[PDB]
Design a protein around this ligand. Structure first.
Ligand SMILES: NC(=O)C1=CN([C@@H]2O[C@H](COP(=O)(O)OP(=O)(O)OC[C@H]3O[C@@H](n4cnc5c(N)ncnc54)[C@@H](OP(=O)(O)O)[C@@H]3O)[C@@H](O)[C@H]2O)C=CC1
Ligand SMILES: COc1ccc(OCCCCC(=O)O)cc1Cc1cnc(N)nc1N
Length: 186
């Protein structure tokens, strides 16, 4: 199994969601970037795995569920089986990561992408090991009810460049944003 990664878009006030949706209007190319990053695998005959909390799963439009060309794993202690359309269910992040090393998935999974929400990002982020954060900085404040955990910059280094990531300011629907890649290894 390859790299462990988080991917998120976040407003200035650290907001990632409001009432089960994003705090900002749809940003088509920002979404395009999420799709590209999570779907593209380096390794022949492998797919990437996406790991998400239960609420995040149900926040994705039904038509867009499962995330196509990726293996979709949901985290939940309440559910007894994967949601309709989902591929896997685990009871904790450790359990999900262990599973990837099972014979059913060990030779199928390339990158693993944590796509939310708050508590899954937090745990992943505070977990010793090699980890990258793909962070889109939405450069306005948006009213939010769920937030990205604090990025500890003593450990997460902001990379000065990354292949396939544009470095300049983007703008869609009057909203400026920029892409960032952070890396830790501890
Ligand atoms: N802007 C962005 O880039 C992103 C925005 N979002 C948005 O943010 C909101 C984020 O949702 P959020 O409220 O944080 O919820 P989550 O997606 O983390 O879902 C929370 C629920 O997932 C299960 N769960 C979470 N963590 C674990 C775990 N470690 N083990 C087992 N089960 C777990 C549920 O458990 P159980 O069934 O056990 O009660 C828990 O109540 C979403 O509604 C979405 O719109 C999400 C990702 C990215
Ligand atoms: C879980 O977070 C998301 C899941 C889906 C999504 O829509 C993208 C296009 C439709 C699905 C596909 O076919 O890939 C958007 C998000 C939120 C999100 C947005 N942007 C970034 N950079 N990270 C995210 N997690």
């Amino acid at each position: 199994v390859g790299s462990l990664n988080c991917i998120v878009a976040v407003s200035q006030n650290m907001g990632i969601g409001k009432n089960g949706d994003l705090p900002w209007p749809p940003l088509r190319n920002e979404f395009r970037y999420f799709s590209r990053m999570t779907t593209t695998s380096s390794v022949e005959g492998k797919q990437n795995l996406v790991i998400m909390g239960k609420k995040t799963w149900f926040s994705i439009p039904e038509k867009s569920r499962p995330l196509k060309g990726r293996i979709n794993l949901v985290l939940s202690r309440e559910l007894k089986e994967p949601p309709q359309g989902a591929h896997f269910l685990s009871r904790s992040l450790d359990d999900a990561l262990k599973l990837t090393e099972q014979p059913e998935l060990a030779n199928k999974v390339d990158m693993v992408w944590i796509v939310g929400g708050s508590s899954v990002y937090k745990e992943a982020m505070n977990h010793p090991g090699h980890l990258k954060l793909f962070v889109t900085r939405i450069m306005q404040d948006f009213e939010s009810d769920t937030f990205f955990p604090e990025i500890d910059l003593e450990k997460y280094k902001l990379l000065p460049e990354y292949p396939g990531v544009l470095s300049d300011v983007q703008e869609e629907k009057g909203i400026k944003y920029k892409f960032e890649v952070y890396e830790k290894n501890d």
